[PDB]
Amino acid sequence: SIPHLILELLKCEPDEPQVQAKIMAYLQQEQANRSKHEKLSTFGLMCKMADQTLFSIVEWARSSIFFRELKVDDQMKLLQNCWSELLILDHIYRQVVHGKEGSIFLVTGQQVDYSIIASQAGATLNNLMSHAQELVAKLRSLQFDQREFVCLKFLVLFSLDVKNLENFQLVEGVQEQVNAALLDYTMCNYPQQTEKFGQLLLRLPEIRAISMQAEEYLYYKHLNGDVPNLLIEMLHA
């Protein structure tokens, strides 16, 4: 059985084929416009890929239950606190669902060999990607499913780390009720895995660590002149 609250969360999920198709098409046109001598560095492609993923994340949040009740200033503070976490969580779940050994599945629907990516990404992003893959392997061994994924999305979005909120009580209530719903759901659907609920929660600090370190690296690359938008606005704020 599924707690009704989780059903309401599932109702808010985007149509993932449409999201990926739109991003794939955007990036195709971008490269098409570019002359022979001005193509995008692979790092630059990933930045634009992440940029366009952020647009869909904002659109998802603004239409979601609970979030749509917040005033816009509260909505901005939540997304500014968790945008990078949501990008990483989405990346991780994509590998859990579609990931094969030795390759990375991108939001465009492209499968890319890790040996290609690791050649171009540099030590820092390779480290963060490898740590993310460790979470992928752990989540796949626990049978991380879509109901749990949407719970973690909402726990990331409605973070107690966000200060200066006009309606902090709603954020606290969502955090608490989604927690109780996840606890119940894992207990009913995976009774044998006593460790599952805790192993899910303990990924959130790790995703937080990975995403904040990812933010700091990208801010470095921006300051260094390496980044081309929404991604930059989120970094600064």
Partner: peptide, 11 residues
């Protein structure tokens, strides 16, 4: 962050 506000306010 005018861009984020716009994405949250736009029709």
């Amino acid at each position: 962050n005018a861009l984020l506000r716009y994405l949250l306010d736009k029709d």
